[PDB]
Every structure is written in C-alpha cells, then in structure tokens.
Design a protein around this ligand. Structure first.
Ligand SMILES: [Mg+2]
Ligand SMILES: [Mg+2]
Ligand SMILES: [Mg+2]
Ligand SMILES: [Mg+2]
Ligand SMILES: [Mg+2]
Ligand SMILES: [Mg+2]
Ligand SMILES: [Mg+2]
Ligand SMILES: [Mg+2]
Ligand SMILES: [Mg+2]
Lengths: 153, 159, 174, 96
RNA sequence: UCCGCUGGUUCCUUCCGAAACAUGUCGCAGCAUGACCUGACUUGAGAUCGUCGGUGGAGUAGAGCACUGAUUGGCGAUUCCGGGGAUCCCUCGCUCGCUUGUCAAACUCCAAACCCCCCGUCAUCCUAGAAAGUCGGAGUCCGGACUGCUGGGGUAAGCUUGUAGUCCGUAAGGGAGACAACCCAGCCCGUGGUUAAGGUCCCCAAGUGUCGACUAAGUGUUAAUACUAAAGGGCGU
RNA sequence: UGGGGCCCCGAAAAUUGACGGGGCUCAAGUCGACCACCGAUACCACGGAGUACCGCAAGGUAAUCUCGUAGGAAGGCGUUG
RNA sequence: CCUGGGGCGGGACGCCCUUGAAAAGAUAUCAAGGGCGCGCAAUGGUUGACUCAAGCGGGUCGGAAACUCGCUGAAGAGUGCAAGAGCAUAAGUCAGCCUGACGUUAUUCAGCAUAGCAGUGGAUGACGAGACGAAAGUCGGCUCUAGCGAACUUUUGAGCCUCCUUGGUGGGGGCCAAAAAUGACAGAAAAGUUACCCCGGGGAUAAUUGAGUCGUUGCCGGCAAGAGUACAUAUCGACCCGGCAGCUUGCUACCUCGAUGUCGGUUCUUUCCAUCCUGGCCGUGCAGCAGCGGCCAAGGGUGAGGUUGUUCGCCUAUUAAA
RNA sequence: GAGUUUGGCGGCCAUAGCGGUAGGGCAACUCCUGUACCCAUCCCGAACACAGCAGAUAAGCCUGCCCGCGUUCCUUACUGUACUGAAGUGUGCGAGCCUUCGGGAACUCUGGAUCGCUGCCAAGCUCA
C-alpha cells in the first residue's frame, strides 16, 4: 500500500490541491497516512505530487511506526496489550504483516486515529524544491520511502 | 524608422488584405536568381535563422542584392541558382493626439520567420563551393537575426 | 458527384429517387399509422406501416394477386382490381386489430378517379376508418366495367365477376 | 458598441458539418421521452422553430413534462435551475 | 440655513470576518438593487472542493490548403474579355490546368492538452443537523502586485486596458544588505528537542570540506526581480 | 571544416564609493556530483489558558480549534445619582 | 456627461452581426470591420409543377452583346436592406385559390450568465373563428438574429359603473385597448462671460523640478557597394543591420496643490570627457612651411566688444585657442 | 420448419460516391403498345392518367470483378516530434526558453483493406 508523507505547508497553494489534501487527511507537514493501491487513490496522489512524497511500504517500517507514533482516541499511546486483546494477532509485527498483505486493515483497531504525526527528519532531507529524479525529496520514491520514513522515526 | 522598432514577435498576426487599407508596395522584384532552367547542381546549401523575429522587406532586398553581386562576380552568371523563400505577408503600422485613439496606420510590410527555417538557397558546382559560402555570409550580415549556414545536399562531396 | 471532400452526397433513398423526406417528416407528426398504396402495371399493393428506430414494421400487407383464389379472373391493372384489393385489405386489417391511419400516396399524382383513390374507396367502404373526402372517389360507372368499354366491347363479362368477387370477399372475411 | 441580442457569438456554434448539411434525419424528430429521463441538448440548425437559447448547448437536463410537441427540461446554469422548452428534434437521449 | 466636499468622534476581553465587482442613475469624489460578511429561526437527509470510467459539447494551440482571400518560379494552353505597332502580318500581360516556394485575427478537409453538463464508483462533510427557506444589521462599487495567456493597444515604459491562480490591503516569525505583495511559514502562554528556506574564510552561528575539470579577465563573487549591455570578431585557451 | 565551455575586444558621464564590506587566483570564482554541521513561533514532547459542541452533573472529544482591517455578535470594568 | 488633465474633435450616450475572447459560460479600452431609426396588397399564406450560377457543342449581320436545342453542374444562384448562419422534389422560380399582416389569454427564456431590475420580444401552449390541401399538415406577416419609448394628459372604439336626501335632463369622473414623445433613447419645460472674481476640496487631475522610456535628438560600431587618373579602407562612404548618453522635443501620471518661489544675466565653487589650445605618438595621394585623419592625456588655459530680455545665433578686432 | 429469389416501407447517411468492364429475366419489376373515358400540357398522351396484349434483357434492377479519382480504417517512420496540465532558488541583456511527473497530434511515408452493412412484411418457391 501507499505511504503519503506531507512535506510542504499550505501558503500560496491552489484551492483544488488544498481540498484534495484535506480529503486525504493531510493537514500539516510531517504527517503521514496509509492508503490502499487502487485507481482512485492513485489519481488523488498523482494530483498532489509536488507537496508530498510517497511509495510502497513494507512490514518492518509500518510495524515500527505503529509501535512508536500510534495514538488512540484521546491522545493515548498504543501498546502491545491493546493489539493483543482487541484484535486477534499476537503482536505488532504479525498485525503489520497482516495489514500489508491486505488481509487486515487499520479499521480493525478501535479508536485509532487515521493520521500519523511523525517527527521532523533527523539528519535533514534532500530538499523541497526538486523531485526525486532531480535530486530532491518530492514525488514518487518507489521502495525508498522506507529510508525517509525510517529517518523520521 | 530604426530596425529594432519592428523586429520582435509580441502580438498577433495582422495580414488580411481585405480588412485593412492602403498597404504600401514592395521593393523586391524577383525571387528567383540565376539559371532557373538548370536542375543539375549537386551541392545545395542554404542560410537558416537562429531565432524568431520579423524581417522588413528592405532588409531582404539588400541581402538579395549583395548576394547577387558576390555570386555573379565570382561563380559566374550561369553557375548558380539562388532562390529567396519567405515572402512578406505581415503588415507594419506606426502611430501618427498622444495615446488617444493610439491605433496605428499601415506603413510597411514584414515577413515573420521561425527558428531553423531556411531563408536563402544556393546551388553550385563543386569548384565554386567556397564562393557560395562567401556570398551567403555577407547576405546574413544585413539580416536582423543571427544566421548559420548548412550544407543540405552533397555534404559528403564537400566534406 | 464526389469530386472532393466537401461534396455532399444525398441519402440512399434519395439517390434511388424513391422517397421524399419532407413529406415523410410531415406524415410522421400524426403519431398514427400510414396506409401505403404503391402501384405498378401488373398489379397493385396495399399495406399498413408504422415507424420504429430500427426500421418500419408492417402489420398488414394485401396484394391484388390474392383475388386469384376468390375468382377475380379479370385484369389486375384496372380500377376494379384496386377496389377489390382495398376491400379485402380493409376487412383483413379490421379483423386483425388495426382500424385507422393516414392515406399516403408517396411520390404519385393525386388525381380523382385514379386507382389509388379506388383503393381508398375500397378501404372506406369496409369500415376501416380513414380521413378523406368523397369528391375524389371514382364513380362506380368506371368501377364496374365501363373504363374498357370503348376498345374491348367483346369483353364485357366484368360486372357479374365483380359481384361474385365482392360477395366472396365478404364471405371469407365475415 | 457590441450588441447583446439572442444570436451573438454563434458563428461556429450554429453551423452544420460539411457532410451533414441539408435535410436532417427524420427519425430524430419522432423520438419519445418519459418522465425523469436524462437528455442532451444538441441544437440542430436546420430547424428554425422551437430552438432554446444556444447558451444551453451541450448541457444535460431531465424531462419534466410535455406541452404540445415540446418537452420541458430542467437545466442547471451556474447554481440555478432553468426551465427550457425544446422540440424533440434538438434533443438526444443519454446512453447508459 | 444647506453640501454628495475637508477634520474629529473617549473603557476591556471573547466568537466570526469581507468588497474595491455587475445593472440603473444629469451617473463618474454620490446613491439604489444584487454578489460577498454576520445573528436568529423553520424544515428534516442528503451534498460535492477531489479521484477513476462512460454517454455528450467543442473549433482554441498546432497543422494544412479541401472553401474564402492572398502568394513564388518552370511547363502547356486560354486560339477570347487584353497592351505592343487591310490578311489584325505575328509579338502576347490578365486568365485557365500540371509541378515548385510562402501565408491568414474576422480561412478550415483536420485537430489536441485545460475546461463544462450528466450517470456510476471511491473519498470527505452530515441527525451534535445536508440541501432549501424566512427575518434583522451592515460594510463595499479610488485598488495594487507576482506567476502564466507569443493576452489587446503602444517605438517603448515602474505605461494603459483584460483574464486564471495566489497574495498585499488586513499577515506575525525565519532568510534575502535594506525590500507592502520574492523563498520557508499562516501566530494562545512557558520549557526542552529536531528540522525547513538559506548558509558554513572574517564581519556572523556552523567547512580555509571531498572528488573531476575550467577561467587569468579582480572577469566573477547578483534565484525571481521595474536593479543585470547588443550585432560582429578572436592563428586567447 | 563543422559543433560546443569559459574569457578578450567592441565598452564614454558628470560630489568620493559600493560583490552588503574586508578580501579572494590548483579560489573565498564557474560547471558536474557528494558528505557533515548550523539555522524559525514550522514539526515532536510536557504543563497551563480560552473557545466550539455534547452531557442532569461529574466531565467528555478537538490531526480535522486559536492571524486580522471595514463590519456583525456575546460577556465584563469604571463615573454620578 | 464621456474624455490617457480640461478644451477642440467626435458619441464608443438606444438597438443588431463578426473578431478581440485564451475549444462550457462571463470578460475592458476614444479596440478592429460595420449597419439600423426602413420598404412591400404583394416582395404575404397554402397547394401544384420545376431547378438555379458558369462553362462546352449548334443555329441567320440575333457579332466575341440577345433567343433557342443537348451535355457537365450539392449550389459555385436566389432568398428586399449590414454581418453571420439556414435552405434542392426546398426556405428558391412560375401558376391556381386566398388574407393567419385574425380577437382574447397562461407560462418559460433573454434583455439583466452565475444573481435583484420597465417596456417589450420569442418560444411553447389554451379559447373563438378561418385559408389552402385527398389527407397529414402549414399559416400569430415578408428563412433566423436590428427597424424603437414609462407615469401624467388629450383623442378614438365596445359595453358597462358613477356624481354627495330622492327622480330626470345637459355636462363631468372611471374601467379595458389603440394613436400622439421624451434620439442625453430606464424619459428637466433651458444660452454665454469673468484677467474684477469669491468659497470648499484635489497631487482622486494639468504648467515644470524629480523618476521611468527613447519614437525623435547627440555620439559610435558591422558589412563594405562605389569614388579617389591604377588602388574600398591617405581621404569620403551608400543600402541594410546593432548600440551608448540622457545634454532637444515627445510619451506616461509614480511624488508635491493646509505653496519645494519661474526665464536670462551677475558672483563663487566644483565634477565629466565625447580634446578647442598647450604635452607625446601613428598614417598620408607627408620635399620644407602648413595641412588631412586617428590614438594617449582632464595638469593649466578658454578673453574683449555692437544688435537683441534672450538661451541660441549673427558680426567686429585680437588671440596659442578664444 | 431453414434457405434462396423477387417486391414494397425503412435505419446508419460516400466503407454507400465517380468512372470501367462481363454476365441474367422462368415467377417479379422495367422497358414497352395506344388515347374511349376521370386526367394534362404556359404548345406537345414528353411527363402525369387510363387502357394493355406483343418483343426485349439493348437500357433501369440483380450478380462478379477493376485501385483508375474521392471517402473510411490499420500498420512502418516522421515521433513520443509539435503543442500542452502541475511544480521549479533552472536559464537569457531582451523578445524568450529549459528540467521532472502526466497527456499527445496534423500532414507526409512503406505496406495492406474499403466498388456498402442491415430491420419489417408479402409472394413464388425450394425440405421434412
Ligand atoms: Mg495558428
Ligand atoms: Mg460609498
Ligand atoms: Mg505571489
Ligand atoms: Mg491574507
Ligand atoms: Mg517579514
Ligand atoms: Mg472591528
Ligand atoms: Mg468632465
Ligand atoms: Mg476693467
Ligand atoms: Mg480657493
């Protein structure tokens, strides 16, 4: 599935792109969301390519993000016990594998906030004036969204 | 008026004869030069343009005159076939009050061009190739745009 | 006359020259059936046709050749043959379920005493409803046997045959 | 001054294709619609009568009723609803 | 006295927050009605700022000569409508066809990318009240700028008049030497932490950093920009 | 002979002077890449205030609340009686 | 009233078409091309019969100017008048019969996207009467989009209501429609001057100081056509092309109208170089003297008088140069 | 009950048109024979109308074919070219242009196809 991370703010931006962004739950820089791989989401992500990065996410990075920056209803940290007693998978790693396989989703965790609020990228990123093919950080990354996501643990 | 007054392409074309009025004539008399009835010149070089602009007809006439003189002086009267290509279809207008009803009136004619678009073409034998280059280099000196020379046919012969 | 890409070629039924589309547009505005009375030399044809986006479906189609069963052993190109054909067509269509429509003569001259108006007479006398006026209906003096009198006096066996065919037409369709 | 009549800026709007001029097909005039049936506005220049304002060209309305030989449509312009009368010769169904 | 014209109009916090535009006007320094802002109430289930697919509208960019106007030579004839000097002795332009070379804002046999109506789907909002409706109070009709449209006009202009988006007006804080509208960012108070734009010889926080070449002119050391010199030439490298 | 990079000539203005200044030459300039660090009220964490909506109250939710001129609305302070 | 200040000129002051206008809709300028303030009892309605423009071939002076016959001919014609669109068994041409160029009345659309605004027009209809046609159907003028005006007032048409205690006569008032006009066309009964002027405002708007631009002005460059008895370059330099300065005049309206004191001369100080003399060099169609052309150089010098307010310019005698 | 042929009314409206060529009429259409009657000519039984037997497939109509003009379609190149939506501290003295992600022609070129497809009904027939 995709991993959309916002990296530019919201001043001097078209209203169509802004409304697509708010429809994707992304309101602030350094915020991440996880969406399935279907043509609707593919087009929606294609329309905001110059303000977010994205790519294919693996099991390890998703499990790490869930264990670190997962909040419940009311700003309550997510723990192993919540996963092991609400859903059926043993630990965060098994649930992450199930989610990435498409056999499960993040809707199976009650009171889970859809948006993930990450930390600014340690060591600094490439730059928000160029796309990936130009030597920057915006645009499609393919499988290398894990490097940027791990950098923003 | 000066040359740079009407040389840029900033506005739409203005060429419909039946709507405007009183366009002055032209000076360029003949658009084909030299041996028209010959068709057996193995080398065919030409002068091309490096940038979009407008060329007045007077500049074209001066370039044609100078190229004709050089080519006839060196190559010979029957040893070439020069042919101008672009005809001036545009019309030039000069305001002449202040800005009150500032729309102008016809004063001349111009021929728009496009990058890498051929203007002149000279065909010669093998022995008069350098004279052809020498002739085409002076003609581009009267022209309002940077110009380069390309050998279209018989490149292997000369090169 | 296709000489270039701008040339305009007419419709297929206009190139054939067997239709008039302005008349067709005027006729379809009635929202109701049409009666077609196209004729030829060896016989006459009558049929009821209604429109559809694909084609023109037809419900009843009677032809003057059908008098051979009844016994109309006379000429099939006369007015009385047209009257007989129209009469049996009217009875057939009435019993079938359809009753009315509009008269449509196509690209033919509408002149009183014609075979088309003879067929119209045969239709109207049968009970098949149709809008018309009587002044164009041919008088029965030519209907019976008397439009061939002046050249075929040796053949005046018409009126008895006409009566027999009329009574047999009534007998079959009643 | 520019005029503001009812046929302004319709040089190409009210033209017919080169292999279309003349008598239009007649079956298009006898098509019949029911209530709540989406249709397309496509003005046929060959017919002079019963023509909506050409600003409704290319819009889609739904049929509301019939007045004689003309259907009543419900077209959206901007954020309003406009009721437009049009004979069935200018209309065209929606293929689902 | 009166003015559509000039100056002034006194305490605190909290919630929301514009228009500098259209039509009429003895109208142009004014006013009315509408768009846009705000408060209350009625009703009770959908709405579409966005994506994908389809039924439809194209006549702009580009391209081209098939219509309308122009346009360059060669060839063959108009045995004309025509100008050159008694069988019009014969020259022969305009014109008609085949080939070559150019065009069009009021040309089109063609023809996009944006865009608009509708259907289905996803997505967001919504009984803590969608869409619609009723009533109360206004301000506003001197705008300006940047990026696109070869926008129109003009020799050009930090000129004048349009249009899409976003801004200043009414926008802090960080960086550009200073900079209304340029880049990052839209901001309740206090403390800790990591980054963006941009930078790292000294002024000045952090590199006299790494790899491979170029320049010998103090050229340069100046994202955009109203602040930055051209044609032409050089056996300079 | 053709195609490219940088530089030179072409190149003249009025108070003394503007790469921001000092200065800078295998660079402290130009071109193609790369590494580390600095640097906001942005983003993360903790505590606090207010607001919006709900709840009988206790209290609950807020990534989807906290800029502001013309202007609309709500609650308070003060003077004399 | 509009107005690249006002004036003068004009009307972009009402209506209709094409482009500008950026392929939905909207969109400005004293933007480009323009037109209308009418004509017709047939140039109108319907049915029937036909096909037009232009060429080619033939016929008597029917001349390359006539009418007729045959062929090709989707339109190259005509349709009252601008532009654009429409039209072929026709919306065109001719013949027959006719007057729907009818009385009354309801919605919706545009004028006036979205999104209020007369009168008034155009599309569907309804009632009552007709014309043409076998019928279907067409007809609410002339194929579609221009040819026009509120309230109040007068006049005209059909029938009714009404005038103050009651009834009548004469005369008034009213309802519905038509005509008479406000072109500044959403509708005042309307000429000038002020340097004798007064008041309130404006840099929302001009003289000219400044800033921007450089058409024009001053000064150069590129190519060199040619002249120079031969020789483009001792000397002069065409056509075309490219610039610099802001020292002439224009263009714009960014600052200043609760005031930045105008032209010329005088006095005194300074800056630039694009060099008139003085210093140094190069070429020559440089014998000498003296010239002609160019390069470096801004240290010093650059005056006295007649006319004229003059700057500018003309003239006089000196001077190394004035 | 399936198919063929003929006839009429049609849908898409040149893939259907233009030109050329070889075959067919038994049932059917047509050509084709005349003017008593209804009907007709701005004159003409030309046409329309009526009355219809003769002969003919020379014409209309039907079947087969032709790339010779015009139209429609596919493929090779031109070419992911021209043009263009979004973002850019990318670049030019200037009029301008470049990089990334996403769309994407027109003519012309090599080679092939296109000389219509199709709906309703009736009649003669042809079978089980
Ligand atoms: Mg173009
Ligand atoms: Mg006001
Ligand atoms: Mg901006
Ligand atoms: Mg703002
Ligand atoms: Mg700031
Ligand atoms: Mg306030
Ligand atoms: Mg005035
Ligand atoms: Mg006096
Ligand atoms: Mg005063």
């Amino acid at each position: 599935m995709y991993a959309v991370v916002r990296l530019r703010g919201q001043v001097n931006v078209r209203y169509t792109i802004e409304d697509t962004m708010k429809m994707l739950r992304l309101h602030k820089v350094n915020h991440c969301v996880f969406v399935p791989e279907n043509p609707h989401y593919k087009g929606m992500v294609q329309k905001v390519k110059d303000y977010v990065a994205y790519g294919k996410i693996d099991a390890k990075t998703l499990a790490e993000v869930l264990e670190n920056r997962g909040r419940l209803e009311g700003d309550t940290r997510l723990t192993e016990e919540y996963i092991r007693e609400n859903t059926d998978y043993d630990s965060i790693q098994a649930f992450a594998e199930a989610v990435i396989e498409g056999k499960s989703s993040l809707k199976d965790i009650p009171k889970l906030k859809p948006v993930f609020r990450l930390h600014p990228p340690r060591k600094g990123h490439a730059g928000i004036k160029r796309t990936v093919q130009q030597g920057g950080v915006l645009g499609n990354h393919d499988e290398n969204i894990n490097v940027l996501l791990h950098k923003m643990r | 008026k000066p040359g740079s007054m009407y040389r840029n392409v900033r506005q739409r074309s203005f060429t419909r004869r039946k709507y405007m009025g009183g366009v002055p004539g032209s000076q360029v008399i003949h658009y084909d030069m030299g041996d028209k009835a010959n068709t057996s010149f193995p080398v065919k070089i030409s002068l091309i343009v490096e940038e979009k602009c407008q060329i007045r007809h007077t500049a074209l006439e001066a370039a044609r005159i100078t190229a004709n003189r050089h080519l006839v002086a060196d190559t010979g009267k029957m040893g070439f076939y020069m042919k101008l290509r672009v005809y001036p279809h545009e019309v030039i207008r000069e305001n002449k009050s202040g800005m009150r009803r500032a729309f102008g009136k016809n004063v001349g004619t111009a021929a728009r061009v496009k990058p890498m678009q051929k203007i002149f073409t000279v065909a010669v034998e093998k022995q008069n190739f350098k004279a052809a280059k020498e002739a085409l280099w002076h003609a581009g000196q009267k022209l309002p745009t940077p110009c380069r020379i390309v050998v279209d046919e018989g490149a292997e012969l000369v090169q | 006359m296709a000489t270039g890409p701008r040339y305009k070629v007419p419709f297929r039924r206009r190139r054939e020259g067997r239709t008039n589309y302005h008349l067709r547009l005027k006729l379809l505005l009635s929202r109701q059936d049409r009666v077609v009375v196209r004729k030829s030399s060896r016989n006459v044809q009558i049929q009821l046709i209604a429109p559809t986006p694909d084609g023109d479906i037809t419900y009843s189609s009677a032809v003057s050749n059908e008098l051979a069963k009844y016994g109309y052993t006379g000429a099939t190109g006369n007015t009385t043959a047209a009257y007989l054909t129209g009469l049996l067509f009217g009875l057939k269509s009435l019993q079938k379920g359809y009753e009315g429509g509009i008269l449509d003569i196509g690209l033919q001259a509408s002149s009183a005493g014609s075979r088309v108006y003879a067929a119209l007479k045969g239709v109207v006398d049968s009970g098949f409803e149709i809008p018309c006026s009587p002044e164009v209906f041919p008088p029965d003096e030519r209907i019976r046997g008397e439009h061939i009198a002046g050249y075929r006096e040796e053949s005046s066996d018409l009126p008895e045959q006409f009566e027999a065919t009329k009574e047999k037409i009534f007998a079959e369709f009643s | 001054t520019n005029s503001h009549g009812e046929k302004r800026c319709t040089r190409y709007k009210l033209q017919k294709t080169v292999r279309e001029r003349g008598i239009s097909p007649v079956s298009r005039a006898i098509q019949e619609f029911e209530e709540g049936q989406m249709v397309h506005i496509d003005i046929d220049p060959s017919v002079q009568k019963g023509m909506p304002n050409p600003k409704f060209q290319g819009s889609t309305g739904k049929v509301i009723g019939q007045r004689g030989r003309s259907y009543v449509l419900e077209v959206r312009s901007g954020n309003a609803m406009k009721e437009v009368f049009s004979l069935p010769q200018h209309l065209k169904p929606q293929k689902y």
